[PDB]
């Protein structure tokens, strides 16, 4: 049982102009220092930064995606960007350098017309990677409400199972996944108030503070390589230490 019981004080990395965005780092290995950024909740470009100093100096190169993204729920893993293809129920896996895409359809997912998984961050899909798997958080188009998590096989970009948390998206601000546990924030994105053991398929007790700010939270992501939460909060890129008990 590695379960998170508290979150440390955040560190501010950088202030930027756009209210919504993502910032992403690799977690498959410890040799890649690149940082990727998307701005806004709709677009087709990604900014790539060589390392933290390049990020701090706004020194980026531009990557052109094969399809527009929606939302702020993307993830990077093993030199690939996973993102929601805007206007569809399709997830794109875009491999860097070779700059070519693969796709996965989630047939029973909400995906347009503001039927968001996380309304606060205009997000329909949240891809997450941790110590226990590659995951896609989404909301059911069948009941219109339930948060589901697809567990993927990374090597084949295919779905192994669809897990029903039974938790209604209207109660969720945002979420992240660590050591195989889904942690979901309240609607004001100040506390984690729900958790779900994805491997055992059951709710588990969790309630702990995340932050005091109530500025808009655009992105919230756990990185297993450094065991920090990464966030984008109204243009502030932040890092939070995590404490496991």
Task: Find out whether 194 and 208 touch, Cβ atoms under 8 Å.
Answer: no
> Closest approach of Cβ 61 to Na ion, in Å?
26
Q: Considering beta carbons, is residue 61 or 215 the nearer one to Na ion?
A: 215
Residue 168 class from Cβ within 10 Å (0-12 exposed, 13-18 middle, 19+ buried)?
middle
Helix/strand/coil for 55: helix
In whole angstroms, how close is the CB of 126 to Na ion at the nearest point? 5
Q: CB count, 10 Å around CB of 160? A: 12
The nearer residue to Na ion, 35 or 220, going by C-beta atoms, is 220
Q: Is 126 in the site for Na ion (CB under 5 A)?
A: yes
Among 174, 185, 223, 231, binds Na ion (CB under 5 A): 174
**Is 231 an interacting residue with respect to Na ion (CB under 5 A)?**
no
Nearby residues of 72 by Cβ (< 8 Å), 6 or more positions away: 20, 21, 22, 38, 41, 121, 122, 123, 218, 219, 232
How many CB atoms neighbour CB 212 within 10 A?
A: 7
For residues 201 to 220, the per-residue mask of contacts with Na ion, x marking binding by CB under 5 A and - elsewhere, is -------------------x
The answer to whether 178 contacts Na ion (rule: CB under 5 A) is no
Residue nearest Na ion by beta-carbon distance:
220
Site string for Na ion, 83-122 (x = CB under 5 A): ----------------------------------------
| Phi and psi torsions of 4, nearest 5° | -75, 130
| Residue 227 in the binding site for Na ion (CB under 5 A) | no
Contact set with Na ion (CB under 5 A): 126, 174, 220
């Amino acid at each position: 049982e590695p379960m998170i019981t508290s979150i440390g004080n955040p560190a501010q990395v950088l202030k930027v102009k756009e209210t919504f965005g993502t910032w992403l780092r690799e977690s498959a290995n410890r040799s890649d220092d690149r940082i990727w950024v998307t701005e806004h909740f709709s677009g087709i470009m990604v900014k790539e930064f060589e390392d933290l100093p390049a990020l701090l100096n706004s020194s980026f190169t531009l990557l052109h995606l094969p399809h527009y993204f929606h939302g702020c729920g993307h993830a990077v893993y093993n030199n690939s960007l996973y993102y929601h293809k805007g206007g569809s129920n399709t997830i794109v896996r875009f491999e860097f350098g070779k700059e070519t895409p693969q796709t996965l359809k989630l047939e029973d997912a909400l995906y347009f017309d503001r039927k968001y998984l996380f309304a606060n961050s205009k997000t329909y899909f949240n891809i997450a990677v941790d110590e226990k798997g590659l995951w896609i958080i989404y909301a059911s188009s069948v009941d219109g409400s339930s948060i589901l998590v697809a567990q993927l096989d990374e090597r084949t970009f295919s779905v192994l199972r669809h897990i029903n948390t039974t938790y209604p998206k209207s109660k969720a601000g945002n979420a992240f996944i660590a050591q195989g546990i889904l942690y979901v924030t309240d609607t004001k994105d100040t506390r984690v108030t729900f958790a779900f053991d994805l491997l055992r398929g059951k709710q588990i007790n969790a309630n702990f503070g995340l932050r005091m700010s109530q500025s808009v939270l655009a992105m919230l992501s756990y990185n297993m390589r450094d065991q920090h939460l990464y966030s984008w909060e109204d243009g502030h890129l932040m890092l939070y230490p995590v404490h496991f008990s």
